[PDB]
Write a protein that binds this ligand. Structure first.
Ligand SMILES: C=C(C)[C@H]1CC[C@@]2(C)CCC[C@@H](C)[N@H+]2C1
Ligand SMILES: C=C(C)[C@H]1CC[C@@]2(C)CCC[C@@H](C)[N@H+]2C1
Ligand SMILES: [Mg+2]
Ligand SMILES: [Mg+2]
Ligand SMILES: [Mg+2]
Ligand SMILES: [Mg+2]
Ligand SMILES: [Mg+2]
Ligand SMILES: [Mg+2]
Lengths: 304, 304
């Protein structure tokens, strides 16, 4: 698979190695891994590396929070593949009041106290910015087990849904939190079109590289939890071509979204609407897109 | 618009210059043009040139029939843009019994006697093969005013419909007639996957180059007859990109359809199923795809 040229250059957080050891070490200590093979596969994925590629300009004392949140969501994402839609929904909904801090965790259940302690530590560091990540996370969690995954979709309908399932909103709120980048409601309304365009890029790039993994999962895991819901399959069905053909076409489309991003940002600046905060924000989104692609094309999570 | 690499070599019928002069001259004499500007535009389109690119291995004494048929259908196709679905249907339905030769033409009405004399001349040359073009033509004509054009369509649904509106079947029967290429029902049923794949290529290549023409038509012509119905607009809406971006992505998809064509052809002969007639047929379909692209790139019908 040869990716067409891109002008987006990825950047990684300088503290990636020490934060990786810290976060991986925490989960290896607390998370209920079934066996040693799973523990090695967990480390091999590099969940803190993708986080550091996603938010390379996060504050040095906040990047670990982002690594912890994405890591635990990665782990849960894999667990849901062996559950039904109903079981996955019950699993996630249990964690939601716990994430809010409204409900105390069962200390004998790792996922509950990991989730609880995480959000408590994040609110302790920055209460206002931490709270603004909550609902975007819950929107993503509920999209994971939405029964729309088992119903016919076109490319457009998928991308609209996948924006929630890919967690575009939580990644944006997490990025702002990790950078301490505060934007007014008016400023955020200005970049909504830019956010929507960025979401499609993150979604499809993931779909492309994670297709083989998800193909295998669809055949081996739960028929609902592991259902093959991806742009690769959808375009392949609409055009009646192979998944490999669909990947090549989708990758060209991703470059068109990169072009649109630059066009939208350029217009924002020309209209005199790009505040210093917005300028940092849109650059952060580009890091997400380039960082997502670098990690996806190199991580062992997708190659083995 | 830089076309992606293709391995197809477009061929043109050697008698293109003589037949173009003959057929253009016929329509300039008989067809009712609004003004001199329209007569220039008609010649500028080169309707016999695309026919010779579509069927480069047509028999020397049969190529002119195909040129006449496609030319009159091109002219009718433009006329229907200023009619409603109801009016357009009425226009086409009147030509159907005339095409069969069941009803005499009004010789004061050019379109009626041109259609009548043409089909009569075609049946006089080869009655059996001429008759086999009838139903594929009527199928195309009735697709032109299908009410589904006024309903939102996905990419898959469009391509399924467009196979009739693009006149895939009529082009196939016309090609066989022009080459005197007879196929058995078994041979015809055998290559239906190849036909469906070829149809998508013809359709999208046309959509790509005729988009600007049809965008303008949608703004100026009848609200029904001029309605914008194309894969370019569909992909642009679903992926939320410009029409130009959608063109570039669709063009890559066309090349994937070219790859599938070669794959399906190779599989036909890998299985014990490629007859001499089928080999000439599927090769003829390649000429249609490459010829349609070559003409669409250069014709003034699309560039102005
Ligand atoms: C596009 C990405 C990085 C996805 C990967 C899978 C995962 C479940 C990882 C944790 C975050 C959620 C939104 N989601 C992001
Ligand atoms: C893709 C082509 C060549 C179309 C162009 C428009 C037209 C009405 C021209 C005459 C033949 C019909 C099928 N149809 C073919
Ligand atoms: Mg998931
Ligand atoms: Mg997953
Ligand atoms: Mg994936
Ligand atoms: Mg038409
Ligand atoms: Mg037309
Ligand atoms: Mg067209």
């Amino acid at each position: 698979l040869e990716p067409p040229p891109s002008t987006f250059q990825p950047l990684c957080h300088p503290l990636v190695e020490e934060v990786s050891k810290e976060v991986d070490g925490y989960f290896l200590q607390h998370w209920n891994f079934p066996n040693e093979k799973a523990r090695k596969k967990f480390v091999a994925a590099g969940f803190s590396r993708v986080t550091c590629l996603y938010f390379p300009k996060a504050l040095d004392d906040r990047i670990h929070f982002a690594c912890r949140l994405l890591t635990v969501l990665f782990l849960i994402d894999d667990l849901l593949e062996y559950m039904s839609f109903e079981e996955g929904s019950a699993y996630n909904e249990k964690l939601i009041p716990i994430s809010r801090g409204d409900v105390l965790p069962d200390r004998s259940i790792p996922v509950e106290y990991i989730i609880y302690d995480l959000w408590e530590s994040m609110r302790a560091h920055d209460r206002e910015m931490a709270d603004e990540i909550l609902e975007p996370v819950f929107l993503f969690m509920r999209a994971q087990t939405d029964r729309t995954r088992a119903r016919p979709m076109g490319l457009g309908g998928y991308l609209e849904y996948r924006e929630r399932d890919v967690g575009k909103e939580l990644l944006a709120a997490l990025m702002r939190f990790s950078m301490g980048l505060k934007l007014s409601p008016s400023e955020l309304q200005r970049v909504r079109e830019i956010d929507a365009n960025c979401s499609k890029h993150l979604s499809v790039v993931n779909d492309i590289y994670s297709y083989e993994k998800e193909l295998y999962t669809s055949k081996t895991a739960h028929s609902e939890g592991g259902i093959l819901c991806t742009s690769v399959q959808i375009l392949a069905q609409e055009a009646d071509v192979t998944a490999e053909a669909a990947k090549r076409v989708l990758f060209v489309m991703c470059r068109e979204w990169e072009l649109r991003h630059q066009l939208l940002v350029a217009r924002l600046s020309a209209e005199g609407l790009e505040t210093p905060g917005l300028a940092a924000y849109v650059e952060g989104l580009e890091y997400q897109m380039s960082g997502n692609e670098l990690w996806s094309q190199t991580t062992l999570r997708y190659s083995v």
